[PDB]
Design an enzyme around this catalytic site. Sequence first.
Site: not given
Lengths: 208, 208, 208, 208, 208, 142, 142, 142, 141, 142, 141, 142
Positions: A68, A128, A44, A40
């Site tokens: 993210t 998640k 960022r 994953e």
Amino acid sequence: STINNQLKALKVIPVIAIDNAEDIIPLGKVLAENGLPAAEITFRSSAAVKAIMLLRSAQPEMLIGAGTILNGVQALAAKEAGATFVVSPGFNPNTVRACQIIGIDIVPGVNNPSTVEAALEMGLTTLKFFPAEASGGISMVKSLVGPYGDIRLMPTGGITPSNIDNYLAIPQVLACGGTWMVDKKLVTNGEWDEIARLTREIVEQVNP
Amino acid sequence: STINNQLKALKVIPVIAIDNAEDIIPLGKVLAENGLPAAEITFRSSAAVKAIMLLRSAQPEMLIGAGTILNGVQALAAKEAGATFVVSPGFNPNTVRACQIIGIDIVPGVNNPSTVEAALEMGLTTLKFFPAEASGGISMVKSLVGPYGDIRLMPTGGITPSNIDNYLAIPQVLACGGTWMVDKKLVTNGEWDEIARLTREIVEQVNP
Amino acid sequence: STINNQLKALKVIPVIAIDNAEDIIPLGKVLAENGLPAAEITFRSSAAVKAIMLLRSAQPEMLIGAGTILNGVQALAAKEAGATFVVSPGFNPNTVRACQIIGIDIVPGVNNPSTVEAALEMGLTTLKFFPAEASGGISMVKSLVGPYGDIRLMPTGGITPSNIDNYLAIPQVLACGGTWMVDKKLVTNGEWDEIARLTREIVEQVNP
Amino acid sequence: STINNQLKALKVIPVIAIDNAEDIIPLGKVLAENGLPAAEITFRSSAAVKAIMLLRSAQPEMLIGAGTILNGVQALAAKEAGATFVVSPGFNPNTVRACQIIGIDIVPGVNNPSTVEAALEMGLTTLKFFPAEASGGISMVKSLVGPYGDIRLMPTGGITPSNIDNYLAIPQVLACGGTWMVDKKLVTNGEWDEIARLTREIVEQVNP
Amino acid sequence: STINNQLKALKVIPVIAIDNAEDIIPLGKVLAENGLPAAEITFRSSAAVKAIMLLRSAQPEMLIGAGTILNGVQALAAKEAGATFVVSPGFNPNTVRACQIIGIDIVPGVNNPSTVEAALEMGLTTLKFFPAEASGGISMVKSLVGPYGDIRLMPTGGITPSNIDNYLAIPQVLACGGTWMVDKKLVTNGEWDEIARLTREIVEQVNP
Amino acid sequence: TKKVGIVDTTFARVDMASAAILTLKMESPNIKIIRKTVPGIKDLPVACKKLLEEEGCDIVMALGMPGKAEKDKVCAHEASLGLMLAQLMTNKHIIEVFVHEDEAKDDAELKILAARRAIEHALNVYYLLFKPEYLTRMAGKG
Amino acid sequence: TKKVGIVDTTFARVDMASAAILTLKMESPNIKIIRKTVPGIKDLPVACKKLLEEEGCDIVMALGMPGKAEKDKVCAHEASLGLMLAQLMTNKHIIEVFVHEDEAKDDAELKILAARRAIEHALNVYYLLFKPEYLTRMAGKG
Amino acid sequence: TKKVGIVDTTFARVDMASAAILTLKMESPNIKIIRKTVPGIKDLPVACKKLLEEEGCDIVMALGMPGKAEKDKVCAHEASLGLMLAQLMTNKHIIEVFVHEDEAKDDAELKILAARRAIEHALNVYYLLFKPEYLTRMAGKG
Amino acid sequence: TKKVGIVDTTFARVDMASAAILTLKMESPNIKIIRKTVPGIKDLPVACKKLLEEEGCDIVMALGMPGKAEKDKVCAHEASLGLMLAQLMTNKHIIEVFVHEDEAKDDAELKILAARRAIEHALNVYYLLFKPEYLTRMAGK
Amino acid sequence: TKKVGIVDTTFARVDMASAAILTLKMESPNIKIIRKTVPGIKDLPVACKKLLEEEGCDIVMALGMPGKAEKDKVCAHEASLGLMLAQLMTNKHIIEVFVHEDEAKDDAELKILAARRAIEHALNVYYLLFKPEYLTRMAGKG
Amino acid sequence: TKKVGIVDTTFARVDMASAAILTLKMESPNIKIIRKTVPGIKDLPVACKKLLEEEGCDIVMALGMPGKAEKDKVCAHEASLGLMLAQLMTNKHIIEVFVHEDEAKDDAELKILAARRAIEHALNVYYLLFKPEYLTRMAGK
Amino acid sequence: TKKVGIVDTTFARVDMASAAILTLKMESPNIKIIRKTVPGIKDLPVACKKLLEEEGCDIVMALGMPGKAEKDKVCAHEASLGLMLAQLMTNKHIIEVFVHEDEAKDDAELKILAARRAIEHALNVYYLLFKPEYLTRMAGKG
């Protein structure tokens, strides 16, 4: 639910924060050859996308998600780069639609009963659970899966080899996300053997 | 507030997960004759609907709620079976709206300030605080009731005789939900003597 | 931008629950002369409005916010009294919209990833993290600021001199809210020397 | 159905003629704590409306009816005061119609076959049999319940501890109304110990 | 109202004629650290606009006005550069109107009764009295403030440490403008120690 | 075939409308009812007039509860003239049901008093609408 | 859309209009606002009526502050009847927002009191315009 | 142009009209002015109304001086309502300029007070006619 | 804007209409409802047809409870064809909600079963009226 | 230029429509298709009729799967007559594709059987629409 | 009265619209103003033309800031011809206010330069609209 | 309610249209889209103009990728003026999305860059069509 089957088999998903996109190539090679063909890649850094594109070219059968993901634009970037699902720290129904519209799988983060119900109402069941330890850990996980028989969870946040077994022992937990075997420090320092050691060790631990 | 007055008097509400609906009859008899004429029957299974109907027939003055109510259809099933209120583990405004329309009271679960504000905005003030221990326990309860003078809470999740007094010491806590005195293991094994003792013990403890 | 800069300089914001509005005058004098020219006055009672008005008259350059702001009506009362920002314990987008319309800045409370995303979507980046200790403390703070590079936090709830340094060590934490140096007990008892001591001590601690 | 069940359990209903409404408070306390949580308050005087209101406040779970209800206006006054049923000495279909319209249950008085048939035709089955002794007593009761299998009676008028058992021995008699344990003379003279004794004695007699 | 209060506190405003805009940085540092955080930057030099911009960046809380403002275009340039008020040597109602329209406060110069009345008629009350000594000095000031109780003056022109006290002794004088502590000769020659000395000396003199 | 408007307030401390509504439905079953609630007693006159003129009410009940101060006394006087003026403009009765708080000795009495007044006045409406003669017969009555 | 008129005075010692304006814009983004200021409280009635009749306002807020003397008391009573009469002539609400100076114990309180009363009444207008049912619920409410 | 009516009395003990006339001509030199004098303060309302309706005045100043007795007090109250009613019938301001004799401590003060009140109200008329915005601003102060 | 007719009987031993009514009002805030009660299950077809044709219903729920005997079985079969024929004459759905008494093991179950079947079918009406596509998805399931 | 309606259910345990759709698009490049899904097999007849009458379909495929009980057997018989009656009212074929659950020995067979029956019948539609002669030729074949 | 259109971009690094708007309102008490913002400098020509043709503007100010590269140079040239062509199609002035980033030595200068150029050009609009003769008198500068 | 044309080429080495299409459908659920592909960048201007004039598009995205040589540079300049001229003839925006091959350092970057530029510009279209005010706000934005 294809994602569910791959997650259930893997049990642990490397959560990757990459600085130099090029670094995804040796990292992916080490992950795949040590038994963990999944990643994953977190958004960022501006680079992550290039990282997804390079990894998909280098390791075509790898399970590649993007993390993210806070909006549909990023979900599209990830889809075009070659990710097959996206994940987000929390649950934004605007992001979830956008993903429905652009046509990519989203596994959104939740950490309480209300957010679970919000997700269920939008037809989602694989979620998640983040941040896992800081939100109450296994005691919290047991409290969510209990009332909500349909959900399947990917706990992430504070997961380590010392606590992952406890999470995996819960039937509705599919897999846990972990950064420790791909820590940026190790990648930055080119500690490939250690990454290989941590990867082999966790694969043996969860899939004995 | 009729719902509240009964809770304030009871202080502890058995949260029941029943396998065989018939089992609600001896269970309700033991609860009522040992001083605890209340039951929240969780919608774990279709057995829950029949259980509410049997209990209402057998113990007409019992306070009977239905739990794990995730949608208006289930709220209706519970109402038609004879429950006088429903409880949800989290807060779904669509469920709350449906309950208003079908005409049954709902006590929804919350566990943080934002969800409390969501409930207040829909005119609700009696809320379940769930999961109580995993969400931060008494420290969390004190943080919610502090800013929100109008709310009244029913903490549930991890409540035991060893910690219930601390929750009840908070003025805005009406009662706590507990499974320990009606644990499925005890019911399954026909441990009626032990259920009675646990029930007597807790009634004496909270209402000395 | 002005508020962010003032918070970053102050590092600690007194969170004040006042009984008699008149008491804000000596309290504000003690805060300001001991190096802490800031106050968040909580709307525990309608009485505070007067406290903000008296404090703004007595200490014109003091940073004055109003707390426990649950709706736009209260936000207006605070604005008219002379507060320059409002704070809410949780995040209510209806309150945020109302503040935008009446023209006062709001710093709303959050405590999980989903609520952070809700705030970001409404264009907010400075958020209160509440209740800080009960929601998981520094471990939780690190989990929020990690995925959300744009947010800046004001942790409040359970902050003391023994734990504030750990929060301030996180770059995205601007300041923490604290009640200990203005505790109602101290104010009620006129322990001005003690309040002065606690204020000097914390100012020296955070701004050595 | 609720009222029938409560009457069947009580077996004796105090019929109260109060002079000073305030007197209903100690009277109700003595009735309830001695095992007879019921009262039919007669509209002998204007003071009764207040008596019903005070009693409902002081003894919320008490079965409270209003008696001597001769018209719908009085039935409304009783309903608004908190009575849950009204009683009339005879049968006035205009009163019964009005009670249906305003929405309060009525138990009207009858004392012969024709009036019973009049009541049955309006859908009523629970009827007061008044005046019980002066109309022929148990011999009359047996003559009414005989042809009319659907009726259930509350005999009142001349009922005493010396004759109540004979009435209660008839299956279709639910309960009898009695004034002796709440006689105005006893109330006026503050003979609370004697009222308590008469109440305990009758409760033990009918519910041994 | 804000400007009046700041002037009353400062008592002396440096009137700055800068050649090289860059020179405003060390000049402003010396003024601010020696207790005089104010500057009126005159539009004589081409670089004055840049000087205001540099000073506002370097000394954000400094009171910064622009002087020698003869038209609305210059007033706009000053506003966009970051000045919060403008000053003119005389009174031009066209300039005053333009400042009202563009939205910046103006303190225009006057030196006789007729010009004062012209200003009052346009709603102005804070006026520069210029050139102060050449127009008759304190005797003239006393003659203007006498008939015009509403005006407040900033005398400038020929003010020195030897005569400023006499002006400040007049209640309606807010502050005086002075060039001596920022004389271009001193700035051109980098006499920073002497500027610091003159600044400390005047601050001690007027605010003992 | 007969219509009644009922105007009450949020200011009042006892719900007067429900009992009046119940009374009228009890006396007549073919009677139409329309309700408007206003904040205060000074808002009563126009709401009453609109119900008479724009909602086709034959009659209106104006329900209010003046407070205790000599200033609520002035408000009610103001509100009463308004009611009278609204009646004279429209050639239609408005039955004023004002229960001052000073008339009861506690809240229990005030709930009782307000409900009773309301009911009786509701009965007065019935007669005005349907039975003028019964009223005539009550002349000189206590 | 919905149009509200706000009439205030120069006599008053607290600006009541800004807070009422802010409240309504907050409650409903769409609403139209029109303001007229008159010198005194006795000038309120006609300004209010013209706004209702000539500027097409659905409702008006009349804001004033009676002084302390028993003569300002008479002025406000005069002004209140005027307001009621203007309402009855036009079949439209005027919400009277009068804050007497005698009600506060200093100026800080009076600024507070006037602003709060204005805001709440502004909320009352919202309900009257958009949500009368909510109003109906509060009956008997404090 | 703008037309102003000025109505005064023979009863009053100070000529209030001349100063008001002078004020308005000073502020707006081309303003039209029309004067009617009536005997008393109770004759003011109709004279004011006729000037608004039959002489085409945009606004009227009603000038009077109530006496000292509690009976002149009633006369002025009567006259003030009349003024308000005349305003509501015609949708036009009447600025009431009443100077009670009780407000001054001698005749010199009363001449002074009446003339000053007249002038300042004359200024209020100009604002109402020509510059409402200025009025809007003064809402705060007083 | 959409009208539903609900036809039930006095013969039935469980009130099926209230729960179906509650469901639809819950699902749609303003959908119009019209009720007719007939004695028996054989009286259902025409009442249903009149509601579709003379009361302007877009759809009807036909609620009944066949008894246990092999003769009530024939009555329901008769009543079911009637329902189908009424649908084909009017080009409008009638959702048949029949709960045979043989399907429950006691009365508590039968109250439960009848109420649940009614509710779900009420949900089916919602979809048929407003969200056909959702129905399309469930195909196969 | 030819349109086909396909009606299936949510009750059925195999998606029969996709394979029938694929078959016809394969045989005719431009043939149109319209789909409606109903809950049960008894809801098939009217949906089929509306597609023929209101959506202008030349033909319809009615797809369903009766359960195993002797009561689902009655439901399908009921549904089959309905289908026949809908055909006779509109002078248009409805090809009934019912796969009883009793015909397969496990779920794998039932998925297989239902898909195959659907496809073949889809081929039958093609011929009925475009090539009747082949059908005539085939009369008297397995 | 006379109406002016102002077209600016999100690309530009200094807000130039505020600078002129203020200038023109200052010079003219009631001159009308209409604003449209486009993404880039190449989007300026049509927005300008629509304001002249569909919003009834007498004149337009086109505000942009070309970047530094020899490719932004080409973009601005392209955008300038567009502006000229829009003017010739509508018989109406568009005052081009382009501040290249290469003209300032830091950001402080660029904020200053862009604001000043905007203001001056805003003054030029005033004269073109109201006082042409003043331009002619200033034949030599 | 709104309509967008997208014109791209076969010359380009990255498919830019799919991502732009996905973006717009994501932002507006109901927006209409029309696509034309031409061989080269010089064929873009007329295809764009026809979509604006003959297919009723409110706006067009013109997507192309100039090569590396100083001759493809001239082709793109030629193509850009064409785009501007097409816009001025029709009073409608064409958003030019040109990604020169010289801007990326390898093919992976160029795929990335072209897709991102397309998406961002797709977002710009959304705002131009639906939310101009956001754009106005971001004036002077980086």
